[PDB]
Point group: C2
Chain length 21, copies 2
């Protein structure tokens, strides 16, 4: 890993869906 401007992550307990932080 070199770049990671993203803090945490959270998945959506539904129709195979998710979202980034």
């Amino acid at each position: 890993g070199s770049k990671k401007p993203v803090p945490i992550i959270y998945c959506n307990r539904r129709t195979g869906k998710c979202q980034r932080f």
Copy 2:
């Protein structure tokens, strides 16, 4: 309070912070 238009919930693994769905 009375209503709940939010299906699921996700907490933020950081400085005592969270968010609603």
